[PDB]
Amino acid sequence: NNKSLLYPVVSTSRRVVSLDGMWRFSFDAKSEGVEANWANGLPESISMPVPASFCDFFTDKESREYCGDFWYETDFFVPGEWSGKDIAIRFGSATHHARIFVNGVEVAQHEGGFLPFDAVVTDIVRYNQFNKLSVLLNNELNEHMLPAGNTAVLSNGKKVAAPYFDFYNYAGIHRPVKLMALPTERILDYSVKHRLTAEGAEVDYTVTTNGDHEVTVELYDGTTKVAEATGKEGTLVVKDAKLWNVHAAYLYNIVIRIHDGSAVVDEYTEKVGIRTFEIKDGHFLLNGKPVYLRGFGKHEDADIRGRGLDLATVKRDYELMKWIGANCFRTSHYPYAEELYQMADEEGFLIIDEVPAVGFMEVGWFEKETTPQLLANHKDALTDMIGRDKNHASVIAWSILNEPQCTSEGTEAYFKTLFDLAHELDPQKRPRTYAVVMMSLPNNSKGQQFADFISLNRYYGWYVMGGMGIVDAEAAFRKEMNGWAQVLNGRPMIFTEYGADTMPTEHKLPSVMWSQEYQNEYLDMNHNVFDSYNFVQGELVWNFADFQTTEGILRVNGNKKGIFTRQRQPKDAAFLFRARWTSLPLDYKGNQ
Amino acid sequence: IRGRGLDLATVKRDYELMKWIGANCFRTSHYPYAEELYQMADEEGFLIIDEVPAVGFMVGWFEKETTPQLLANHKDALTDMIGRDKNHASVIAWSILNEPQCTSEGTEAYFKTLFDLAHELDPQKRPRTYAVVMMSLPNNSKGQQFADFISLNRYYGWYVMGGMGIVDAEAAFRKEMNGWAQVLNGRPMIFTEYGADTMPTEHKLPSVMWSQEYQNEYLDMNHNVFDSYNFVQGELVWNFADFQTTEGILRVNGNKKGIFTRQRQPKDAAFLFRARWTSLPLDYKGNQ
Amino acid sequence: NKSLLYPVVSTSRRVVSLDGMWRFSFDAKSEGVEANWANGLPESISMPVPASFCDFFTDKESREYCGDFWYETDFFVPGEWSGKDIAIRFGSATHHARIFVNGVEVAQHEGGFLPFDAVVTDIVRYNQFNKLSVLLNNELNEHMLPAGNTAVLSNGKKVAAPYFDFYNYAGIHRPVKLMALPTERILDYSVKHRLTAEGAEVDYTVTTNGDHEVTVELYDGTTKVAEATGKEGTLVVKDAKLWNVHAAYLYNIVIRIHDGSAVVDEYTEKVGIRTFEIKDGHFLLNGKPVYLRGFGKHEDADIRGRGLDLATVKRDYELMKWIGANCFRTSHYPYAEELYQMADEEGFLIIDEVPAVGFMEVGWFEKETTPQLLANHKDALTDMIGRDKNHASVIAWSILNEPQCTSEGTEAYFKTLFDLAHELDPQKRPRTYAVVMMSLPNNSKGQQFADFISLNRYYGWYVMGGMGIVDAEAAFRKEMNGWAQVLNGRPMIFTEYGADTMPTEHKLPSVMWSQEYQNEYLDMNHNVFDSYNFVQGELVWNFADFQTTEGILRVNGNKKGIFTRQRQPKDAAFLFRARWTSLPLDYKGNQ
Ligand SMILES: O=C(O)[C@H]1O[C@@H](N2CCN(c3nnnc4c3sc3nc(N5CCOCC5)c5c(c34)CCCC5)CC2)[C@H](O)[C@@H](O)[C@@H]1O
Ligand SMILES: O=C(O)[C@H]1O[C@@H](N2CCN(c3nnnc4c3sc3nc(N5CCOCC5)c5c(c34)CCCC5)CC2)[C@H](O)[C@@H](O)[C@@H]1O
Ligand SMILES: O=C(O)[C@H]1O[C@@H](N2CCN(c3nnnc4c3sc3nc(N5CCOCC5)c5c(c34)CCCC5)CC2)[C@H](O)[C@@H](O)[C@@H]1O
């Protein structure tokens, strides 16, 4: 097996052709497509852009909320000059459950809507001809998948997603689909670990190939070689290394090659930032110095396109995060497109990487009969995420769950499995966390013991004791924080969520909940609490921007806790954060 | 700005809007209004259902230790409201409670005192009613038997089975109506409340709850049910205009179920209601 | 070797997209060329392509930058392409472009809305990476399309001063594609349709840069239905399935150069068979009258400016179908080819418009730079018709938007361009232009050249709005009585009418800027349209709110959209849906 999660690159040995554009599309309400031969051509179809969720193109709700099997189809050319090479199709992701057919032959299956996979087609494609690519997708939710939920059936027989999570169940092909030509012997993986030294830095590496020819690794500052090594394991000695820092990124160029004499059998290239990250004495140390995390929980969410990758929106989001003085964000509730991490690497932003283990909430959750099948799917996602993302300088922590019912029996065995795995799989041994739900308190949470740092999602002053009660909210908040003080045992804490829904058009004096003035007051109270406790070492606000949810009486066209609108313009709270975050030192509270 | 203060400019605008939209009736939802509002109803020819502030009556409510003292305050309010308003041509019925827990033990004793009193005090013996909460069903309400006509407050498609569930909301609404048909004993029914919160600035296609398109679709679904049942003889929508509530996660600067904004300007739904209500004859369904 | 054909992959051709994150730098001092920036930017930021650069930034100075700026990327040329011609296609580059590869300047282009190629066969290194550097300039002048001025602020910074009502978005707005092509290749082809008793016949021409034999084959699906040899010929299609409004049918055309048993080059494309002509004051599509209904659009969306985004295109078409439109005009510049491909597939009619907007104030067409403007106008008309002529959806050419056609010099300028459009278009489709409010039946020197008249009128908005709307209708009806006397049996459509409308505003009774006023305005205008037999189409301004330069009249851009910029309906969208889906396709087609 030649599994590889490496980003597709063009090199002397590798080719890449994007298959994005307008595809053919059809719902399959009776699940008849396979036996009816739809993999060889849809009888009826519409056009559908890839990448994008399908939901928000339509003007009818039945299509927006379709839940079941659906098909994507396109034709791709395979140049004849590729005939010596391995041929594969990379899917950045496909949501949620995928079956891939090429020329009518089923060539791949995949579980989980937010991580990449390849379909090898070397012996199925016709060369110098067009070939049919058919993708049978399904977007139904069940209780043993990431993310977790249910599928209901309406009184008219129609299926509808019923998530256990607070975001719309967007599905489709959300990320670029890329046809690749690869040499039969090739680099499948590599890893880097960094060490600071008196003369500079040292990068310890491994490379994994599917063959035995010789491996070299060269490191370049621009076009100037600064270090090289031979062998699948080694050390790169970088004199006076230029370290990657917050808002001061520096990226070297790594070149990995397989050699057969004077012939280069395979070349893989990628940017690499050199930096250390670790928890010591209740602080996050980046290159040996403390950093106070500030930023957001985000979503892959925008108007029209659902979760589809859009480099324009990504660019605007980073411009806004720099303007506001953020330095960190969490990939709230699923791994993002690789491109978002690539830009974080360039811009000097810190990332907490999170698998889609959200909705594990109300017998308690971790005693359900399906817990073993869920754990399997969870290990798979955790493995692929760490494998895909481990070499990004920007990625500094792993978040293993969001708001699980960690008061349930069965929590310890479940968490121990996954937290050990995260330790095993990450060569850099980055810290591990999970977002603690409101119902899980210092005194009853069976899961908090496993985290290297505690991440709280708290809504004191919104879901509890909002409005005129915010005085009581603050007192109840401090009460819980005194509880955490007794179980932390020197570990740091961050907030991964806090926020208040806010209509971007709403002004009131005095404030009311849903007004911009209330949002500012809400945030000031929370920051007063944060600043009161030595062990609070970061604040990520919920959310960067307004985003879509299922309809309900609580959701005024989606979630309105954004600091920015869905159109990436600031609410009043954006200027409050800008004043706070740009005025706190990078090492705020670093001596506490 | 003025809260509940009387302001004849606003009253005048409210009547201009009710005439424009084709309304003929309103209920004094949750408390008796200032006299001037009934005087204008008399001048313009509107029907009024007069309601005392017996709202919030959530051990069941009517087994509480303070029930005797509540009843005494309720008797006084009913007496002064009928005493003050009985001579208005516009006032044509008495609403004695809004959404009491009329499944509670002790409901019958409390209701009988008050409904008997309303009969004794009114020289014109106008019909008596109360707004029935959603949890009070044909098969478990101990209070509906007292009403001369039934007034339902229903939110099928808002609080219950909203959004993509509206198809289920309509089915459950019809089933419950089928159950009311068996207890009405020939009495008429009106809806005193139905509605959906709507930001006056929100448009979406397809609709989402809180959009003006959802408000229109919600109203259409409900009207289709109303029109299916011969015994439905009136429809009062909640609410005429956005109004202030206590702060809360459910209230985007107060209640937004208004057909008009708090500034007395129409949302899309006002044009839906204008087209419907001005097209129905005054005696719509009068032979059914 | 000029060719405006859409880049395709075939047995002889390769295409690799260069879209993604590029490097970018402003060049405020215009120093980059002499400073060797083409071999690498000293300082740079990342920038998505395709997109406008403007709306990413948080500072106004960057959003409003006017001058030289650079885009750069590295691109791989596979060694297996040796022997092929290597070219980089730019869908567009706004406004004035100089292209460098490995430090060598290989192309220049004028005009920000039409494609061009940079041939780099002998400049690139094979099986290696090469540096692509793009020096762009977005300054406006009075002799370009579109027209404007570039002002200098008191701090010395330049700022665009358009003579047109849309923001001066610039950047690389459309896909950049690297191509490998055979040295002898198809450069162009044209089709021309005729209906017959037995089906349809397609008269074609093909242009190549060589002498080897040419064949043309037409396939229904995979099923060949016609073929022919020669650079000119006819394809006989029995029982031809015609392309129709909201009912498209597309055949596949395959053009090949042959050298014995070898296919030297192959080009493929979809083609819809249909006729379109003006007869007795009506638009005839496949011989039957069509009443045009729809919009003026823009290439405009949140964040990306005029950047191509298939997601927004798909939504726009879903909304146009939902509302009952059948037609739009490419308001004030040719759009990305992808929009026309979708119109071919969905059965939408398009009026293709060149960026000849801003020609207004000695009168405009007596300005000293008039001959320079005309030359740029001819090139854009040449490239637009050459690019778009084989689209079944394209059924008319708009040669200008609101020129001062009352000016001296109008006749000689217009004749040149209306004659040229016939020389450029084998199908001889109807030609028009959008007539400004100040140009009336009795004083317009331009209107006589149009095959159908297109009016932009704002009776009830810019003229006699509000309580004056009763006078606006009377003045409108008088002007229409005047047009009746000069039409000479020609049809008329409205290409613009509309009223700015905040999507949040309700008032009873209406005020200008409220949704109720927008509805009343449209009702008044439609009452007038329906009073005149010669009105054969209505295109409202605009499909969606779009960005303009800042100003007291522009509440964050133009608010005349029927949809918001986020593609949600205002009240008037429901008004149009009820009207446009109630009108028969051949509405007013017998009068
Ligand atoms: O919601 C958000 O914005 C985001 O927050 C996170 N999660 C936080 C907790 N969570 C809730 N979501 N919705 N409602 C409530 C909670 S908890 C809670 N507790 C409540 N009471 C506690 C006991 O005393 C009285 C108050 C009440 C309510 C809620 C709402 C109904 C009435 C009272 C799920 C989402 C998610 O990580 C994030 O993906 C999501 O977007
Ligand atoms: O609310 C209005 O606009 C107006 O309506 C009337 N009253 C209607 C019912 N009433 C409610 N107020 N707020 N929330 C709920 C109800 S009932 C209900 N049922 C619910 N579930 C029941 C079981 O099945 C599924 C649905 C849920 C909720 C509510 C809210 C949280 C989510 C689930 C009190 C006010 C008042 O006469 C009026 O003065 C007031 O202004
Ligand atoms: O504007 C739009 O929305 C769109 O319309 C088209 N164009 C139409 C006319 N045009 C104008 N733009 N702005 N203002 C005026 C005009 S004409 C006119 N005439 C006026 N008076 C003439 C003499 O009698 C009394 C009325 C007055 C005004 C205007 C403005 C101030 C009040 C008096 C240029 C743009 C463009 O093709 C389109 O790209 C643009 O987006």
Author numbering:
A (entry chain D): 2 to 363, 379 to 608
B (entry chain C): 305 to 362, 379 to 608
C (entry chain B): 3 to 363, 379 to 608
Task: Tell me what the authors wrote about this structure, in their words.
Our central finding is that specific gut microbial enzymes, notably, gut microbial GUS proteins of the Loop 1 and FMN-binding clades, mediate the colonic reactivation of TCS from its inactive glucuronide metabolite, and in doing so they drive the gut toxicity of TCS.
The crystal structure of Fp2-L1 GUS was determined and refined to 2.2 Å resolution and reveals a protein tetramer with a GUS inhibitor UNC10201652 (GUSi) covalently linked to glucuronic acid in each active site. We confirmed by circular dichroism that the mutant proteins did not exhibit significant structural changes compared to the wild-type enzyme, indicating that the mutations are directly responsible for the observed loss of activity with TCS-G. Furthermore, methionines 362 and 455 are unique to Fp2-L1 GUS compared to another Loop 1 GUS enzyme, E. coli GUS, that we show poorly utilizes TCS-G as a substrate (see the alignment of Fp2-L1 GUS and E. coli GUS in Supplementary Fig. S8). First, we tested the effect of GUSi on TCS-G processing in vitro and found that it inhibited the conversion of TCS-G to TCS by purified Fp2-L1 GUS enzyme, as well as several other Loop 1 GUS enzymes, in a dose-dependent manner, with IC50 values of 0.64–4.9 µM.
